[PDB]
């Protein structure tokens, strides 16, 4: 032959190194190993958004469970927390609820106070308390 193939086994090894823990011929035969590695890479690249959504849902469920244990709901709690210029993501909320029950208890108390103040305002239109905890701090 003329300048035939002389560097093929290394390609097979590089393709199989990612298949050193599969079942069946997927960890030996190159034909099926190629498709297996391709599918594995595609799924690993597509599962990032799924992982993000799963983590978000898990944090939401944890915060809802903490609120229920403290005596509140997740939507109302989030609304009251947002209605106080106290922006806090869900990860920190879950971490506090897990490793800081007193912090989450104080946060739930503040949320309930804000809820009651908003209800009183909507009922009587203020005049002129405007909620001691309400009244956002203006900026310029």
């Amino acid at each position: 032959l003329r300048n035939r193939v002389t560097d093929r086994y290394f390609r097979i090894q590089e393709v199989l190194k990612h298949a050193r823990h599969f079942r069946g011929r997927k960890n030996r035969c190159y034909r099926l190993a190629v498709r297996t590695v391709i599918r594995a890479f595609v799924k690993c690249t597509k599962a990032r958004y799924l992982k993000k959504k799963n983590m978000r849902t898990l944090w939401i469920n944890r915060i809802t469970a903490a609120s229920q244990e403290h005596g509140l709901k997740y939507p109302a709690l989030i609304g009251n927390l947002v209605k106080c210029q106290v922006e806090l993501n869900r990860k920190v909320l879950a971490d506090l609820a897990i490793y800081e029950p007193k912090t989450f208890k104080s946060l739930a108390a503040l949320a309930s106070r804000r809820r009651h103040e908003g209800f009183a305002a909507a009922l009587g239109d203020g005049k002129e308390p405007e909620g001691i905890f309400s009244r956002v701090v203006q900026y310029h």
């Binding site: 193939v5 002389t6 093929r8 086994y9």
Partner: protein
């Protein structure tokens, strides 16, 4: 397995060989040798071609019309078959037309 095991021996190569040290020498004799011999006559190869690029079919027709008078029977038949196949594939089969 397709790949062998033991490496090969040291492929010795004499860069200063008699032909390498004299490769290309005595060429271009026309531009300075008051034009006495064309470089196309320096190459040592076939007799039917010695300074004409051409193509496959053209080279085959050349070899036929220049050596076909003293070629073997089987060789001449194979050359004729090759010429006919090349013609049928070029002047009919292909693309861009």
């Amino acid at each position: 397995i397709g790949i062998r095991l033991t490496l090969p021996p040291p492929k010795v190569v004499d860069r200063w060989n008699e032909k390498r040290a004299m490769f290309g020498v005595y060429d271009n004799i026309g531009i300075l040798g008051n034009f006495e011999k064309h470089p196309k006559e320096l190459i040592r190869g076939p007799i039917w071609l010695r300074g004409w690029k051409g193509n496959e079919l053209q080279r085959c027709i050349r070899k036929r019309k220049m050596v076909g008078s003293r070629m073997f029977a089987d060789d001449l038949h194979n050359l004729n078959k090759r010429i006919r196949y090349l013609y049928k594939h070029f002047n009919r089969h292909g693309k861009f037309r």
